[PDB]
Amino acid sequence: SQPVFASPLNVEKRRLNEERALMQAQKANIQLPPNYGDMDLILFPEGSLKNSNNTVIPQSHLKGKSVALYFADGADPKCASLLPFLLNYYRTMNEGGANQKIEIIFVSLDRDREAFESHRAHMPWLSIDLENPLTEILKRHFRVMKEYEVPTYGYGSRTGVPSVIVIGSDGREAQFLPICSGLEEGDRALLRWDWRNTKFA
Amino acid sequence: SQPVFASPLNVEKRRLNEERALMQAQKANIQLPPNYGDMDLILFPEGSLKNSNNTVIPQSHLKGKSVALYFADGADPKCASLLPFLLNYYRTMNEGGANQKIEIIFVSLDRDREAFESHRAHMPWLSIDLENPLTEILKRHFRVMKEYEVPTYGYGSRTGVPSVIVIGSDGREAQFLPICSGLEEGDRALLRWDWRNTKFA
C-alpha cells in the first residue's frame, strides 16, 4: 500500500501475492493476508521497455541504479522547457563517473502515436509504448493527471505534467522531485535528486 | 440460518449441503439435515468479483481481511454524502500499517449498466456486476431495500441504502455500521469497526 492503497497496480499486487500465499498454505502460522514487505510484483514485464532504435530491454538491466519515471506531455510548454535541462543533467551526470547511475523511463501523456514518436525521437533514455496499459496503470499508481478526467478515488492530484518520480523496488516513491509541487522549483529540482539512497534493487 | 432463515443464499446452501450429505450417506448416524456448523458454502462464485481493470479475482483472495459490503445507489444524496468519508477511512486505515486490514465490496442498487459503471469508476475497491443475480440474492440475504418492493417474509428492513455490512465466511452479519439506523451516526459511525475479531476466515 505504497504510496497509495487504491491503485490498480496495488490491487494486482495483492491478487498475485495472496493467490500465491493461499496455494502455498493449501500445500503445507503463515500470515493471511500477506505482509506488504513479503508481497512482490513484476513491474515491467519483458516487453515493456524499449531503448534507442527500438530494441527490447528487460527489467534485469535496471538493477543497482536510481530509476525515475518521467511523466511527460508533447505539446505542454512546460514540458518543452523542462526537456533540455533534464537532457543536460542526464548527460553530465552519467559522464561524471565510472558507473552509469541514473535512468529515466518515459511515460507518455500524448494524444496519439504520431505525437509519441515525434516527441520520443529526441530522447535517449528508455520509453514505454502508448498502447501498453502500463502507461495508464503507472499513471494512476503515482497519481499523475494533466486534467481532472481520471476517475480518482478521493486522491489529490499529486502532480501535474511534467513530473519525475523516483521509484523503488516495491513501487514506493523514493522521493518526489518538486518541479510543479510544494517547492515550485522548476528546472532546478533536478539537483535535489540523490542517487546514493534511491537504488532500484 | 443467519442472519435470517429465509434468504436465497441460505436456501441454496441448505439444498447443496444436504444434497452432499445424502450422497455420502448413500455411499457409506451422521446427522441429517446437517448443522449450520457442518455446512460450508461458496459465497462468491469464480466469476463474481472484479477489480478496477475488470479482471476477476476468486473468493479465496479475501482470506484474512475484514471485508464489508457497501450497498450504494448512484443518485441518492445520502450515499453521495457518505462516499468521501468511507473512501478516506479506507485510505487511512489500510495505509497505516504493513498489513492489509479491510476490503470493500460494492453492491449496486443503481438503475442500469451505464450509471453503474459511471458510479463504479469512483470506487477503488471490489464490485459485483449489476446484471449478475448475486446482487439481488445478497440484497434479500441482508434485508437491505430502498423501499418495500421485493417481499420480505415477516421480517423488516434491516436498513436503507447506503449501508456498510461487515460480513463473515458463511454470511454471518458480523456487525452493523450505524449510518442510517437506530443510532444515526452519519459519517461518524465508521470508527466503530472492530477489524480485529471479524476476519474472513
Binding site: 505504497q2 481532472y148 489529490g156 492530484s157 514506493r172 510544494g182 | 495505509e95 497505516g96
Partner: peptide, 22 residues
C-alpha cells in the same frame, strides 16, 4: 457542463504516514 475543483490542503499533501527507517 463544468470545470472541477482540484485543490486539497497542505496538511494532507505532506503529512502522511511515512514508512519507518531501517
Amino acid at each position: 457542463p463544468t470545470l472541477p475543483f482540484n485543490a486539497q490542503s497542505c496538511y494532507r499533501s505532506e503529512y502522511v504516514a511515512k514508512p519507518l527507517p531501517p
